[PDB]
């Protein structure tokens, strides 16, 4: 759908009021299935490795998050439709410039293609960016044709601060999700009992990301 109206008349007010915004049927069936094929080929060719954490202490990562992931820049052969998804997400964010809170969004991460390979894997309750690493908006595209969450689980449960309800996001085919990455939105991926795929990017606030980079580059 045209980016300007979707951004300004839906995504922006949704985010500023609730800190969470769901856009269903984002790219359509044909493109969504092409993304699915590209993701399944990354899976089948052994590209995924254990999901990792910002800080590592004694714990196995698998007691925290049970997904397997790879990072995609968008230009790789065989990831062209993932690249189109990334470009579409970026187009929406660019049309939101200066209207998402007080953030100045200038950049983002690579895309994280993630699979919870059934078997009850999930992700314990956490905050995407608790300590100021620059991430201000998490954007996730789901691609699970045939997902029945009542059987297969895998709901992303978000606990938005100050709200009388939590937000249950089933990982529905062709669903796009945005939410503030900071402590306003703790969230868990509830156990998945079938193979579950999602593609995430995180958008940076320029000034916070600059401070985080200074911290990293000085030790």
């Amino acid at each position: 759908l045209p980016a300007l109206k979707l951004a300004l008349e839906y995504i922006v007010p949704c985010m500023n009021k609730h800190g969470i915004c769901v856009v269903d049927d984002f790219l359509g069936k044909e493109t969504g299935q092409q993304i699915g094929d590209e993701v399944r080929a990354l899976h089948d060719t052994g590209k995924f490795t254990d999901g990792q954490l910002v800080s590592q202490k004694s714990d196995s990562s698998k007691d925290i998050r049970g997904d397997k992931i790879t990072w995609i820049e968008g230009k790789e052969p065989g990831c062209e439709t993932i690249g189109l998804l990334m470009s579409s997400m970026d187009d929406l964010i660019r049309h939101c410039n200066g209207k998402l809170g007080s953030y100045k969004i200038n950049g983002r991460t690579k895309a994280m293609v993630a699979c919870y390979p059934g078997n009850g894997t999930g992700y314990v309750r956490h905050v995407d960016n608790p300590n100021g690493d620059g991430r201000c908006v998490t954007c996730i595209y789901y691609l699970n044709k045939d997902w029945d969450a009542k059987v297969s689980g895998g709901i992303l449960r978000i606990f938005p601060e100050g709200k009388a309800q939590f937000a249950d996001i089933e990982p529905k085919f062709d669903r796009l999700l945005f939410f503030w990455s900071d402590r306003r939105n703790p969230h868990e991926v509830q156990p998945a009992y079938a193979t579950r795929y999602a593609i995430s990017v995180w958008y940076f606030d320029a000034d916070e990301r600059a401070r985080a980079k200074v911290k990293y580059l000085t030790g």
Binding site: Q52, K110, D133
Partner: peptide, 20 residues
């Protein structure tokens, strides 16, 4: 309390980052 960075999903801190 718990250090929430130990539960936060990793992102590269080095390299550039993609510029919009």
């Amino acid at each position: 309390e718990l250090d929430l960075e130990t539960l936060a999903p990793y992102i590269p801190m080095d390299g550039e980052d993609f510029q919009l």
